[PDB]
């Protein structure tokens, strides 16, 4: 099936997150499908990447990539690109969990685990107590990353937009924040995690494998006009994106996985920063005790309940429904049912379908769009069928 072409550019953040994109180019796996001319293009930060995918490859900037939700609707709306619509397609989920929060080393013996409801009060008198309000931080407004810790703020019972100071900051100056003390906690994922604690900036209060066990994360969405155009070749994509998946989550091939995201041309940083993490070990810190689990790591092709790769509908809905239970885009997105519309028009979950049928994965394809109820930490759950429960069942809220 000849692509249409075979180039594309797709962009990437220096993350764990990115490498199905980094090993499906580097082992051969696009080139298997004839996508030969595949380029992998290291973003900035998010906002260059937002930037980059609205003015497409032909204006200098990316085709799709590497995205946080709901990025790709956002985008498609025009609601964090100033009006300008730019329709995008989520083609597949790259990764669940390599996520997770780190805190300061003043906050130790506090409380500010996995579960802070115990902490919550020193929390949100942090400044009557120490001098300012506890701050917090991710890299992007409104994702994944700033999701994460929302929930675990108010889990606990602390509200993320009037208990402290949330907010979007560089991951570099973040951790120098940290090192500073003028830095609490910080939303984040691998390689970071690693370096935090072993460079005694900070600890692990929680993995988001522990937040929501194998959690929807990062996903690749290509522009819509692209996708129309080369559909041959977006499904080419799809296939070499899944077997690299496959492969990264063989053991036996994982040493050259990190050895290949970690060099000078990708990632570019030691390989003894990523070799723990993709063995599912992390050293948490603030004397709890450190996991060692292969299932609590970053997994690319199959978790604990299904398929990794395969983008539920049932998923795109819960980062809208969250969306709305922040009050973000108030106007853009005022109920569900339109989070709803913008999902069908978004979600390609059916070229993923005809992608692994294609190519020989029938059997690891998910008989539904939806992956049921899904259960956090703290025993809330989130019924796709009903998303207005599960925002009457949660304590702190904008709606």
């Given at each position: 099936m000849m692509p249409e072409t075979a180039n594309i550019k797709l962009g990437y953040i220096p993350i764990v997150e990115a490498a199905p994109l980094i090993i499906a180019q580097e082992k051969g796996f696009f080139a298997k499908y004839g996508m030969t001319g595949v380029e992998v293009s290291k973003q900035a930060n998010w906002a260059s990447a937002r930037d980059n995918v609205t003015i497409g490859s032909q204006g200098g900037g990316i085709d799709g990539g590497q995205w946080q939700m709901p990025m790709p609707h956002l985008i498609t709306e025009g609601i964090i690109t100033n009006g300008n619509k730019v329709p995008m397609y989520v083609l597949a989920q790259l990764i669940t969990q390599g996520n997770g929060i780190a805190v300061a080393p003043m906050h130790e013996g506090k409380g500010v685990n996995l579960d802070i409801t115990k902490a919550a009060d020193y929390i949100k008198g942090f400044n009557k107590t120490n001098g300012r309000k506890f701050k917090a931080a991710h890299?992007?407004?409104?994702?994944n990353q700033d999701f994460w810790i929302r929930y675990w703020f108010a889990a606990g019972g602390?509200?993320?937009?009037?208990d402290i100071d949330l907010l979007a900051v560089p991951p570099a100056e973040t951790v120098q924040g940290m090192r500073n003390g003028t830095m609490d906690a910080f939303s984040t994922g691998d390689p970071w995690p690693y370096r935090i604690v072993t460079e005694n900036i900070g600890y692990m209060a929680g993995l988001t494998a522990q937040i929501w066990p194998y959690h929807p994360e990062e996903y690749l969405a290509i522009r819509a006009d692209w996708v129309d155009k080369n559909p041959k070749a977006t499904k080419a994509l799809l296939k070499g994106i899944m077997e690299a998946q496959q492969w990264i989550d063989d053991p036996k091939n994982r040493p050259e996985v990190v050895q290949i995201v970690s060099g000078r041309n990708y990632f570019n940083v030691p390989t003894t920063i990523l070799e723990s993490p993709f063995k599912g070990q992390y050293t948490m810190g603030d004397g709890q005790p450190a996991i060692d689990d292969f299932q609590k790591g970053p997994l690319y092709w199959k978790d604990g309940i299904g398929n990794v790769s395969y983008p539920y509908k049932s998923h795109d809905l819960w980062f809208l429904t969250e969306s709305i239970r922040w009050g973000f885009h108030k106007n853009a997105i005022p109920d569900l049912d339109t989070a709803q519309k913008i999902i069908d028009k978004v979600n390609r979950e059916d070229l993923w379908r005809e992608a692994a049928t294609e190519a020989g994965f029938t059997a690891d394809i998910p008989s539904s769009t939806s992956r049921g109820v899904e259960t956090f930490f703290d025993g809330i759950t989130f019924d796709p069928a009903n998303p207005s429960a599960y925002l009457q069942s949660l304590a702190i809220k904008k709606v």
């Open positions: 890299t992007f407004p409104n994702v602390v509200d993320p937009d009037t």
